[PDB]
Design a protein around this ligand. Structure first.
Ligand code: ZN
Ligand code: ZN
Ligand code: ZN
Lengths: 78, 46, 261, 297, 48, 67, 152, 115
RNA sequence: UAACUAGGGAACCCACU
């Protein structure tokens, strides 16, 4: 059972969007459709709004254990 | 090869070579100035 | 939905200024006319100086900058001249430029004043304004013995939007509503404000009563020329230039509508 | 003088509003600044928070145009021998990708030659202590971000009897956005924007300001001497005299200057009705405008 | 024109980056270097 | 150093008026009367002549380096 | 005019195997040339080969061996075999006998056409189409098409 | 160093158009007129002449940035009218007004010169 | 038949926010 917050932090937002943008710029297959968008930042934004980013966030607890959260499992701020 | 300097005191056209000392040939003044260049000097009048 | 019917009354015409009134036109038209007076009336001014010798105390950029600001007679020649960028010659040609030559050598113990008399034109009608055949000559540089200034200058066509040396006007005095009937400016104490030259009120009055239905008309002008053009020629070429800009915009807009539709 | 870091203004003017001590400071004969028609106004918001709006048409006429001088010196030494000569790729090592043809046969550039950053102005070669390359390049270039015209090249002997050269580079500095301008009252400010004469506001006589400063520069600073100098400059320029601003002078106060200004057909407090340069409509507030002394820093 | 950002070449920006390379470092909207997949650096200041 | 060709503010020609201004000043005119006699009406043109310092006459006291 | 690769380090001489198949003995003071690591060579099958590529020898005096590409020439390729004991494994083979297993710079010009017409400048840098012109009158260096430039 | 050349305020470089037409989507019968290498001198007269037209419901111009040299004129008209012909009629009225003003100024020149 | 870089330190002074 996971005890961390169900909301997805702005630091998680920043790093997930950056990692996904770097992956898309390195020709990772996009999980959403593209309406002519070219910048991998905006593609990562559209992927995050659709909760389709294939990234698991491993939140490390201070006692040493971790908790694996999917991006789709977490509440997006916007 | 032929270089002209202008003496700072008496304003004399001075043919000197290279590696010889900067010395005015008829007044002995040791400061000379280069002449204005012969290249194209064109300014817009702004 | 249609055009104005503006009227012109000229109160003073002189070789150095024109002082006229435009009535029954809009404020934007009058202000654009003033803006074309300052910025968009083409004259001939020096814009290309080749310095061959300059022994003066002033360096070459200084002399070139002073030569650019010397006004030249531009009447009925600026219309014939093309812009230098628009002309197909390699160097300058008579169809787009006027060549000037200056060669002054000071061999006397007195100071030699290099003035606009020393600017020698290759065109009989594009000459410095002070060289017209009373007033003194525009001083370029002062020379002591041993100093010289040899240069070749080319004078081309341009307007004041590019550089202020092509501005043909000295002072464009512009007024509307001299008695402040529109209250477009609000005096905190209107008693201490001096009357305008075009004011139509008595000494006891300070400003006109407020007119709620009024618009700005009856614009007052005083276009003082720098001598490069006649002031009437300044106004006529300004009206022609604003007309030409509007006509060119009409042409491009018609092409854009035709291409889009 | 081959001074390092010399700045000279083209058209310095003595102040219209001066103190009597400036006669002994010799500020009249070597002035630093220009009397400029200055309106204190909020115009387009480009003069906000210690910034000024300059007249582009004034700057085209030489207003606050200055010239910057930088002197480069270099010796040739005999220890390893250094010589002033034009380097050649077939016999020199370490030559940069610069136009060495701007140098003359003596290894020195001539006056009147246009130079840019990383341009050789003095060609110096030092011999290797021990084939393809026998001499090493030790030439001097300009500063990387500096351009200009070579103004003067002076060649002489130094104290130890070696060949010594000094090169002065002339750079003409047009006032632009970001150049620092200050009044004589601690009111410094960079140029925010430059408008042409038709874009500047204008009086009924067609006078446009050379500099527009923000009204908010005044009240927290309490430089009332700025406003009084502006008023006295208006009176002096209309009257045809030089105004006296010696501090502890009871013969000069604000009311006397105001009455003198009112005698010349202006509003006594120095306000004028300005018109918008873009629309031609007169501004609702009457703008304080007059000649005051700025310095180009 | 002095500071650069390293943009990864995708099929979505191949033409824009190609014309940026073709413009080179002399024009402002251009490019300074090409970084190949093996880390080899191609300088566009000195024309290849 | 030398009189500007044009007034900075408006652009009226003032480069031809410095020698005439000096001649009027030595003819015992006041500076205001001398400015009025030269046609300088706006104070922008008036302080071009009123505030001018002629450094060029002091520069001419030095002999040129070439002659 | 000739390149080479040293096969043995000696005290005062270099043992270098050039494109001969013969080892020469030269002094220390040879010069250094920049290697073309991006050069392209062609084998007998007209296939592209580059540096660090294993190629087989199927023709020539030493057909049957196998080598690795170190340096390239117009019609020769340098080969290495770790099992070959002569001259430290260095050898040379021909490319076709294997199989894969400006004057304007510094010149004063006049812009004779365009918006900058009449400006005098010095070309700092130039290509086949454009040129970087250092304007004499301004502090700018601008990119001008070479069809608009006239050498003066 | 970074000074733009003085001709860029009025000279179209190779590639751009003088005036572009863009339809404004949020309201009907509205267009955005982006005009290059022009300033307040032309935008103000076009704006005021469009304001004289009773079939024009909105007429405004702006310079988005004074460092660049484009104006954007926004015209909204009545549904029985279009902003394109409103712009055309405004330019035509300005041209005719300037022609009348020029010929009357010439007449006044002759009157003042001949007394 | 384009062979492709920059250079030290220690003290002081001045200016700037
Ligand atoms: Zn001598
Ligand atoms: Zn021509
Ligand atoms: Zn003036």
């Amino acid at each position: 059972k996971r005890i961390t917050t169900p909301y997805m932090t702005k630091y998680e937002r920043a790093r997930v969007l950056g990692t996904r943008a770097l992956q898309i710029a390195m020709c990772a297959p996009v999980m959403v459709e593209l309406e002519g968008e070219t910048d991998p930042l905006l593609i990562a934004m559209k992927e995050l709004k659709a909760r389709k980013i294939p990234i698991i966030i491993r939140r490390y607890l201070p006692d040493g254990s971790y908790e694996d959260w999917g991006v789709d499992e977490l509440i997006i701020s916007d | 090869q032929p270089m002209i300097y202008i003496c700072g005191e008496c304003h004399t056209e001075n043919e000197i070579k290279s590696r010889d000392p900067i010395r005015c040939r008829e007044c002995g003044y040791r400061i000379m100035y280069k002449k204005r260049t012969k290249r194209l000097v064109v300014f817009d009048a702004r | 939905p249609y055009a104005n019917q503006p009227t012109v009354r000229i109160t003073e015409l002189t070789d150095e200024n024109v002082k006229f009134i435009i009535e029954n036109t809009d404020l934007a038209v009058a202000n654009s006319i003033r803006r074309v007076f300052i910025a968009e009336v083409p004259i001939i001014a020096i814009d290309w100086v080749q310095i061959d010798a300059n022994s003066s105390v002033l360096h070459d950029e200084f002399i070139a900058h002073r030569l650019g600001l010397i006004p030249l007679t531009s009447d009925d020649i600026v219309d014939k001249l093309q812009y230098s960028r628009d002309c197909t010659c390699e160097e300058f040609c008579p169809e787009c430029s006027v060549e000037f030559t200056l060669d002054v050598r000071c061999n006397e113990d007195q100071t030699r004043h290099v003035t606009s008399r020393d600017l020698i034109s290759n065109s009989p009608r594009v000459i410095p304004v002070t060289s017209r055949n009373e007033q003194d000559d525009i001083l370029i540089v002062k020379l002591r013995k041993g100093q010289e200034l040899r240069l070749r200058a080319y004078a081309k066509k341009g307007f004041g939007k590019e550089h202020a040396k092509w501005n043909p006007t000295a002072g464009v005095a512009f007024e509307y509503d001299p008695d402040n009937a529109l209250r477009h400016t609000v005096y905190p104490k209107p008693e201490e404000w001096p009357k305008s030259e075009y004011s139509e009120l008595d000494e006891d009055e300070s400003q006109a009563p407020y007119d709620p239905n009024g618009k700005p008309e009856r614009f007052y002008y005083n276009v003082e020329s720098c001598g490069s053009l006649r002031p009437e020629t300044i106004v006529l070429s300004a009206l022609s230039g604003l007309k030409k800009k509007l006509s060119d915009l009409q042409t491009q807009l018609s092409h854009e509508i035709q291409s889009d539709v | 003088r081959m001074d390092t870091l010399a700045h000279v203004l083209y058209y310095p003017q003595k102040p219209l509003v001066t103190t009597r001590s400036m006669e002994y400071l010799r500020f009249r004969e070597l002035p630093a600044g220009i009397n400029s028609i200055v309106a204190i106004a909020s115009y387009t918001g480009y003069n906000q928070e210690d910034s000024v709006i300059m007249n582009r048409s004034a700057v085209d006429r030489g207003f606050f145009r200055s010239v910057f001088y930088r002197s480069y010196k270099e010796q040739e030494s005999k220890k390893q021998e250094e010589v002033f000569e034009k380097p050649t790729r077939e016999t020199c090592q370490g030559m940069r990708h610069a136009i060495y043809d701007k140098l003359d046969d003596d290894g020195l550039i001539a006056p009147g030659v246009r130079v840019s950053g990383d341009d050789v102005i003095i060609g110096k070669t030092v011999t290797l202590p021990e084939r393809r390359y026998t001499k090493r390049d030790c030439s001097t270039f300009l500063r990387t971000s500096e351009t200009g015209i070579v103004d003067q090249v002076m060649v002489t002997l130094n104290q130890e009897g070696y060949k010594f050269c000094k090169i002065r580079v002339r750079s003409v500095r047009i006032p632009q956005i970001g150049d620092k301008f200050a009044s004589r009252h601690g009111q410094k400010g960079t140029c925010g924007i430059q408008y042409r004469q038709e874009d500047m506001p204008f009086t009924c006589e067609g006078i446009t300001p050379d500099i527009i400063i923000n009204p908010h520069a005044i009240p927290s600073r309490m430089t009332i001497g700025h406003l009084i100098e502006c008023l006295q400059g208006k009176v002096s320029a209309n009257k045809g005299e030089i105004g006296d601003a010696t501090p502890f002078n009871d013969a000069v106060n604000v009311q006397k200057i105001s009455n003198l200004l009112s005698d010349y057909g202006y509003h006594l407090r120095g306000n004028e009705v300005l018109y918008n340069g873009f629309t031609g409509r007169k501004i609702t507030s009457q703008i304080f405008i007059g000649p005051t002394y700025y310095q180009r820093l | 024109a002095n500071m650069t950002f390293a943009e990864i070449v995708t099929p979505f920006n191949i033409d824009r980056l190609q014309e940026l390379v073709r413009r080179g470092n002399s024009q402002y909207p251009g490019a300074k270097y090409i970084i190949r997949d093996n880390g080899d650096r191609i300088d566009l200041r000195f024309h290849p | 150093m030398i009189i500007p060709v044009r007034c900075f503010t408006c652009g009226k020609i003032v480069g031809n008026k410095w020698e005439a201004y000096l001649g009027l000043l030595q003819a015992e005119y006041t500076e205001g009367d001398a400015l009025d006699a030269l046609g300088l009406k706006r104070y922008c043109c008036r302080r071009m002549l009123l505030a001018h310092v002629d450094l060029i006459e002091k520069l001419l006291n030095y002999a040129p380096l070439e002659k | 005019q000739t390149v080479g690769v040293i096969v043995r380090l000696e005290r005062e001489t270099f043992q270098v195997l050039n494109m001969y198949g013969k080892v020469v003995t030269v002094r220390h003071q040879v010069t250094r040339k920049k290697d073309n690591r991006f050069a392209v060579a062609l084998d007998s099958e007209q296939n592209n080969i580059h540096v660090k590529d294993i190629v087989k020898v199927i023709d020539g005096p030493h057909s049957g061996r196998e080598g690795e590409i170190r340096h390239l020439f117009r019609s020769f390729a340098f080969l290495h075999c770790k099992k070959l004991v002569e001259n430290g494994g260095m050898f040379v083979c021909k490319t076709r006998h294997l199989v894969l297993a400006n004057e304007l710079i510094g010149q004063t010009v006049r812009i004779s056409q365009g918006p900058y017409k009449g400006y005098i400048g010095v070309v700092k840098d130039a290509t086949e189409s454009t040129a970087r012109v250092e304007l004499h009158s301004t502090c700018q260096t601008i990119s001008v098409d070479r069809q608009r430039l006239t050498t003066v | 160093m970074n000074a733009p050349p003085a001709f860029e305020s009025f000279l179209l470089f190779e590639g751009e158009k003088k005036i572009t037409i863009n339809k404004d989507t949020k309201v009907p019968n509205a267009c955005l007129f982006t005009i290059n290498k022009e300033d307040h001198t032309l935008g103000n007269i076009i704006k005021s002449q469009l304001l004289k037209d009773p079939q024009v419901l909105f007429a405004g111009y702006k310079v988005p940035h004074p460092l660049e040299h484009k104006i954007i004129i926004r015209v909204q008209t009545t549904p029985d009218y279009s902003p394109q012909e409103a712009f055309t009629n405004a330019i035509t009225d300005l041209i005719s007004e300037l022609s009348l003003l020029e010929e009357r100024f010439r007449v006044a020149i002759k009157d003042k010169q001949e007394g």
